[PDB]
């Protein structure tokens, strides 16, 4: 052994243990999710209130890339910020040469290739985040999830972090109960509920809900934060279902 | 025991990191197979979407490298996409510099050389993938060339890759021993696809619905993948005879 | 243990021990408190001397007219990070004629620290910082850890025994947040909060360091006789 | 092995902590700050009697208003002194004035954590930097390989230091004359030195606003040693 | 960034260079290849040990043209050989033909390949090549020649030799049969006989790879009208040409 | 600078070099010594662009002195002149070439022979019985071509040189303020102190 | 580039690669220097496991750095060449820019600085060499003798020895060298130096080399005979 | 990161020795013996090839003796491939010197350069040293005929007679016994072959296991000739010195 | 061909009294025969009781003043808020100017 002491080393069963250990940091993070709706995507995340002294609404976690893409992650927050900074550079350079804003699948591969690059050498460490991201491009809505290995796929809904199992089952019900699809507004409400449900595995502390969305009809295909009345209404709808 | 961690020789002249990269190649538990027609080259691969939250249209191990070249990969998707991006870059650059489309066998050689380098240079790890390149080459005709983590490559009459490659391989060998020709003697690619699926069914002893397969077809001047519905139409024709 | 030789190695439970050890250097550091109202933000720091012949090591560093910080941990690392902040504040003023938002400063520090946690040969920073400022959205307080986590707060404390100060501020929250237009009262609540973390020694005139920034108040540092008033 | 820039589980840099051990093996150096000047004294510690001890240079001028004493791996100090001299002279070129003692000290200390895998290891020497400027008068700093520097009223470094520092704790007060500081350095050096203190195996220096930095002649120091002997014999 | 700037091959207390010894062990496992020098030619030969019967093994070329008058074969790691062939073809141009307007003599091309192999044995962050080469060639002033190059970069000229698996037996077989009056056809016949011993299965034109350095082939030049240009001396024998000589066996 | 002459007689080499240094409108100096001793039996005189002359000469001198110490040995005049030529040939394709012409007079202790090398700023080297740079040859070579003998003594060399300098002082428009004369022979290098 | 920190601190504050460099010095042939009133002598031990050696051409142990300064050493011979080349280059560079040859102390400070740099630069090991550097400052008649070691510390010595068995010959010099009266002639100084080596050498044969340096670039190596007369006269006063 | 796999090729042992230099010297002690002997009228180089074969093409083979220029040759003991790297470098230094000064490079200046190159690999760069010891035979008009050796440390020394490779202890004792200063090249030729004859690990010394060279001013009038002996000429000198 | 310089007119005047100093400038900014502005201030308070004007090409003048103000800021940061004396400011400005010796700030500076 000693195969797990250095990134990019294959174990005798063909595994990269440092990547698997990165996944442990992810599983240790707060719960974050995304829901692909009819003409858009919704992102939501649980923010643990470690103390009264945290200024409410003020430690924003969901991040925009360009103007049409939202990103949320669980695990090591700084690693996620590093990945989004890179994503912002990739988006800028794509738009600079090709004019059109980067399509979501194209953007997914840019993040994927970069994250995968950090599994090729022992001089770097894998990313300790799983990232849920997406938005609207010329072919419609797209939701993706990307892991520390560089692995990503497109999703109907996605979840990561500590309450991932609970969120998944919730997400599966929605897929079954709505083959035609979910409206963006329905998706916001559902997202609030699922984060409330998943917060059981994290019940020690209270939390603060944070939601965002990009919808062709509701935001003109731009990424926006769900604030004020529409946020409250989703918090209320969530409170009801956990009661 | 550090000769196990990086690509240096063990006392028996072995490269363990390369051997373990071959082992990673089967981690997706997917089998693929490729055969040649008179005019076409067909590749099929099992498709497994084990999670209902997945968008199945985004789950794929078949890649359109250039207009004329397709690639199926056996191995984890991050390494697969690394290889796919590189192969796309190399094919485009080749056309820019030399004024003609990169041949399937030349791309395979190039990707095999890159792989050879990872087995000799310590700072790079091998990619845990096997790459099967297909086209209908303008000089060589229907072509299958396959690369592995040792930097080995060779052309094939037909080939198979994955956990159950041996069963498929022996099944294919038995057919070609019989027919005594290097290819499926069929006019249409539709029939070459049906042949390919049929012999995978026999060899794995399992049946397929339209969502259990992935199919790629190379013809003169293009490579394309089939939709679930084109595959359904294939399956139907197989059952009705 | 087998996983703590460098910053580029996760442990089997997904931990980064070199970063955790860096965090440990802050814990050994002398206590410093930060808190704010809606008009002002205050830093209080207990300075440490080496012995009776020695000076008390300064803990508070000005970054710009509207921004500054206090440190606990490796002081040379605070110098590197505050220098970086000065430059970024400066860049924003010179290029955009714009005072750097405290929130933006926090993001920049996070990203600078993060790079030293993901590559070979580096080491994480071994210092924690409390950043106060007054910008276009009012008074702000930030806490920085060398894991790269930066958090916006009404009040906090870091260093040895910071837990006492921190609990105090947690109870007082509803009082001190309202101390608007009265710099001296805010500082008092700060000196009271830091007192919940003293033992053996008390606040003396070469011991105590205070800084304040707010509505019509450039970031200014008080030491020596200028803190007698609050002792 | 392990990186040269590794933290220990207590949050200390191994290499810095270990250089501190090398410094403990160094010959003793002492400084005392008064309102009339700062004194710097060192134990020379020649390894053999054939070694010409006035070739031992552990007190060093940085500029007219700044002096320096060292203890530890003293070969390591040469690039630090070179940097300090360049920084003092460069500041005067750019600003037509004397550089502050603290600014000079900070500039030397910026060198210190510049090691990695930049130099390959921390410095194995500690410095006492003494001088005068108009804004903060007479000053004495202790510069460590950790990059930290502390200001002191009086300070000892090297192998005799915690015996010497206890002494300095007792004897220093804010009214010491320059003469009193000189005798004190001599007396504490005499205390902690293996060999018998004389003018060839210890060395004194001061910095005054008026005359700047001066290393004392052996004849001048011989007189102060004599004068010390007599005041001790007188109680 | 490659941060392995230190040697991965070093001397052990007994004076051994382990990685070179281990490269030589990898060569030992390799399929047998041989070469024989005649008075009017050289032959190099090996077995095309096909990895599956679905593999088209004519697309895997173990015997390689380096210059029109120089060819190579190997035993050991095939991929290492393939990249060395690319580098050898190139260095024949860059460090010789682009300077002197003619192809290098065999011994100097061998020298260049050998140097490349030596450097993989001392440069930072690489392992040695896991191959031994046999390089046959002709040039005007040295005539016909045959060299072996090993993983260390050492090279030696031979009258005849073998490398890989069955080399100890093949070399004894060659010592009996070699003399300084062989004509190229004799050396081909001996090569085929020698190679049969180390081959288990099928033994025919499709499983044997054989090339010669002999007479100039004006028919393979591709153009006429320059008297001094008479065609390459390297020629790979066809499947059929090998089988014709296997009846005469 | 201006006039530099050399003549190789039976047993020595004599270099004569003008003393004037002129900055445009004023003769700034009238005792300038346009020469450097490269080794005990090798002397180099020089003329060309201001600054570059002395910089080049001291650079060459430093290099030959380094060689002498490293090997405990004096390079032959031929070897020194080849080293100097290569430096000028490399310099001519530089970003800013040394604009410096030199004479190298050396006594070869192994062959027991005086040798005179003329090298211009392009790295054009020639070994000569007598030589010059600039316009000096135009006024003096017809005299040297007439009177020169390979068996002349040192004193006859100096007398022929006096005649050359007299012709220069007559027909040349510029006042070069006389010459400093140095002799290189088996005993080393010395300066004739009245000329 | 290869960057590895080879010289690093140990938990007890030791740099072992520097300390092991000194062990290489201890193993080297003995070297000694002694200053007279108006000269300095450098004596070197030659290990006599090597006959069939050609002494005309075999690298000599004392090296001229300039015409007025010499350097000898104990330790790795190959390493010493690197320092000698650098010192010679620096001596010429000093002449070129300052228009004065190096002082003996300046040259020592330079060599010592090179040695120190190699104890805290990545990718290099320390020099396994200690040196004795002797001569006279330009236009000065006071003799100079300095010593350097692998760590880069240097100092001035009335007399000093380095290399194997230098403990013994230092013993001898400390009891036989009087500072108030240095060997007042070349003769006395050379005799005191040969005596010091005889404590340690074996045959006073071609085992002992002696180089005398006087003011004004007056430097000469004694031959086998002249040393032999010193060896001779020394033992004849012994039996007494 | 990568540190884990670094052997550290340039460190002292606790006794102040260079591990890799010592282990390279151990490697060299298994190489075929090479001998150089210096006479008043020339130099001899003699070396034994390692365990051969009947199929080796001897007359086109070189493994021990190499020309650096017309006045200087080397005998190699150790890794041949390593030797050729250094040999080509020395050939270039010699031509650089000839170009610069228009004089042939003095023997020692060449030897010192090659030795400095070897020294560098022991102090910086983290690479393994060259597994090679050289004997240098050459002539220049300053010191005349000269013999040197260098080894993986980059140390070099001058000799009247010397051996490197296998059995140097035995060889050196034999040379020391019979060597005399006034000896001539033809006498040196015999001493060299007699010494190899006695120290060889082979059963007998034959022409096909030797390489041989002389540097003589047996080139007509004040000039030097190098002669790398052909296989037939080695065969004749074995008979003539009565070893076969 | 691009000319990187221009001339914005302006006249400035500095006079030192016994215990005071004045720095005056007109407020007109011009190019060629046109007025760009009738009030574009050209004399600046730089902190530490120092006033500055860099007259000539206004882009270079603005760049220089901006760099000097910044140098005052960093002098405070680097030297314990020590006041930058006028002689020290002057030497500092020499170095700012001479740093562009081969592509000068096309201005006449007075402090």
Curated annotation (Swiss-Prot), chain D:
Q: What is this protein called?
A: Proteasome subunit alpha type-5
What family does this belong to? Belongs to the peptidase T1A family.
Main localization (coarse): cytoplasm
Q: What is the effect of changing residue 41 to D?
A: In DOA5-1; slight decrease in activity
Entries under Pfam families matching the protein: Proteasome, Proteasome_A_N
Q: Which UniProt keywords apply?
A: Cytoplasm, Nucleus, Phosphoprotein, Proteasome
Miscellaneous notes: Present with 17100 molecules/cell in log phase SD medium.
Query: Matching InterPro entries, A to Z?
Result: Ntn_hydrolases_N (IPR029055), Proteasome_alpha (IPR050115), Proteasome_alpha-type (IPR023332), Proteasome_alpha_type_5 (IPR033812), Proteasome_asu_N (IPR000426), Proteasome_sua/b (IPR001353)
Does the keyword ATP-binding belong to this entry? no
State where the protein is found. Cytoplasm; Nucleus
Explain the purpose of this protein: The proteasome degrades poly-ubiquitinated proteins in the cytoplasm and in the nucleus. It is essential for the regulated turnover of proteins and for the removal of misfolded proteins. The proteasome is a multicatalytic proteinase complex that is characterized by its ability to cleave peptides with Arg, Phe, Tyr, Leu, and Glu adjacent to the leaving group at neutral or slightly basic pH. It has an ATP-dependent proteolytic activity.
Disulfide pairings: none
Residues annotated with Phosphothreonine modification: 47
Question: What cellular component terms from Gene Ontology apply here?
Answer: nucleus; proteasome complex; proteasome core complex, alpha-subunit complex; proteasome storage granule
- The gene is PUP2
Q: Which PANTHER family match?
A: PROTEASOME SUBUNIT ALPHA/BETA
A single GO BP: proteasomal ubiquitin-independent protein catabolic process
Source species? Saccharomyces cerevisiae (strain ATCC 204508 / S288c)
Residues found modified as Phosphoserine: 48
From Swiss-Prot, chain G:
- Location of the protein in the cell: Cytoplasm; Nucleus
Q: CDD domains from the xrefs? A: proteasome_alpha_type_7 (cd03755)
Q: Which GO terms describe its cellular component?
A: mitochondrion; nuclear outer membrane-endoplasmic reticulum membrane network; nucleus; proteasome complex; proteasome core complex, alpha-subunit complex; proteasome storage granule
Going by the UniProt record, its keywords in alphabetical order are:
Cytoplasm, Nucleus, Phosphoprotein, Proteasome
Q: Which residues carry this modification: Phosphothreonine?
A: 58
Q: InterPro entries attached here?
A: Ntn_hydrolases_N (IPR029055), Proteasome_alpha (IPR050115), Proteasome_alpha-type (IPR023332), Proteasome_asu_N (IPR000426), Proteasome_bsu_CS (IPR016050), Proteasome_sua/b (IPR001353)
Which BP terms from GO are recorded? proteasomal ubiquitin-independent protein catabolic process; proteasome-mediated ubiquitin-dependent protein catabolic process
> What SMART domains does the record point to?
Proteasome_A_N (SM00948)
PROSITE patterns named in the record:
PROTEASOME_ALPHA_1, PROTEASOME_ALPHA_2
**Subunit and partners:** The 26S proteasome consists of a 20S proteasome core and two 19S regulatory subunits. The 20S proteasome core is composed of 28 subunits that are arranged in four stacked rings, resulting in a barrel-shaped structure. The two end rings are each formed by seven alpha subunits, and the two central rings are each formed by seven beta subunits. The catalytic chamber with the active sites is on the inside of the barrel. Interacts with CIC1.
Other remarks?
Present with 16800 molecules/cell in log phase SD medium.
The family annotation for this protein states:
Belongs to the peptidase T1A family.
Protein name per Swiss-Prot or TrEMBL: Proteasome subunit alpha type-4
- Which gene is annotated as encoding this protein in its UniProt record? PRE6
Swiss-Prot record, chain H:
Q: Which organism is it from?
A: Saccharomyces cerevisiae (strain ATCC 204508 / S288c)
Q: Check the record and name the Pfam families matching this protein.
A: Proteasome, Proteasome_A_N
**GO cellular component terms attached to this protein's record:** cytosol; nucleus; proteasome complex; proteasome core complex, alpha-subunit complex; proteasome storage granule
Question: Cross-referenced NCBIfam families, in alphabetical order?
Answer: PRK03996.1
Q: What binding partners and quaternary form does the record give?
A: The 26S proteasome consists of a 20S proteasome core and two 19S regulatory subunits. The 20S proteasome core is composed of 28 subunits that are arranged in four stacked rings, resulting in a barrel-shaped structure. The two end rings are each formed by seven alpha subunits, and the two central rings are each formed by seven beta subunits. The catalytic chamber with the active sites is on the inside of the barrel.
Q: Tell me which PROSITE patterns the record gives.
A: PROTEASOME_ALPHA_1 (PS00388), PROTEASOME_ALPHA_2 (PS51475)
GO BP: any one term = proteasome core complex assembly
CDD domains membership: proteasome_alpha_type_4 (cd03752)
- Cross-link for Glycyl lysine isopeptide (Lys-Gly) (interchain with G-Cter in ubiquitin), residue positions: 99, 198, 230
| Compartments in which it is found | Cytoplasm; Nucleus
Chain's role: The proteasome degrades poly-ubiquitinated proteins in the cytoplasm and in the nucleus. It is essential for the regulated turnover of proteins and for the removal of misfolded proteins. The proteasome is a multicatalytic proteinase complex that is characterized by its ability to cleave peptides with Arg, Phe, Tyr, Leu, and Glu adjacent to the leaving group at neutral or slightly basic pH. It has an ATP-dependent proteolytic activity.
* Name the UniProt record assigns to this protein: Proteasome subunit alpha type-3
Indicate where this protein is primarily found.
Answer: cytoplasm
Swiss-Prot record, chain I:
- Principal place of residence: cytoplasm
Single GO BP term: proteasome-mediated ubiquitin-dependent protein catabolic process
Where in the cell is the protein located? Cytoplasm; Nucleus
User: Would you tell me the Gene Ontology cellular component terms?
Assistant: cytosol; nucleus; proteasome complex; proteasome core complex, beta-subunit complex
Give the quaternary structure.
Answer: The 26S proteasome consists of a 20S proteasome core and two 19S regulatory subunits. The 20S proteasome core is composed of 28 subunits that are arranged in four stacked rings, resulting in a barrel-shaped structure. The two end rings are each formed by seven alpha subunits, and the two central rings are each formed by seven beta subunits. The catalytic chamber with the active sites is on the inside of the barrel.
Which family does the similarity line name? Answer: Belongs to the peptidase T1B family.
Q: What does this protein do?
A: Non-catalytic component of the proteasome which degrades poly-ubiquitinated proteins in the cytoplasm and in the nucleus. It is essential for the regulated turnover of proteins and for the removal of misfolded proteins. The proteasome is a multicatalytic proteinase complex that is characterized by its ability to cleave peptides with Arg, Phe, Tyr, Leu, and Glu adjacent to the leaving group at neutral or slightly basic pH. It has an ATP-dependent proteolytic activity.
Q: What is this protein called?
A: Proteasome subunit beta type-6
Species for this entry: Saccharomyces cerevisiae (strain ATCC 204508 / S288c) (Baker's yeast)
By which gene is this protein encoded? PRE7
* Location of this fragment in the whole protein: 20 to 130 of 241
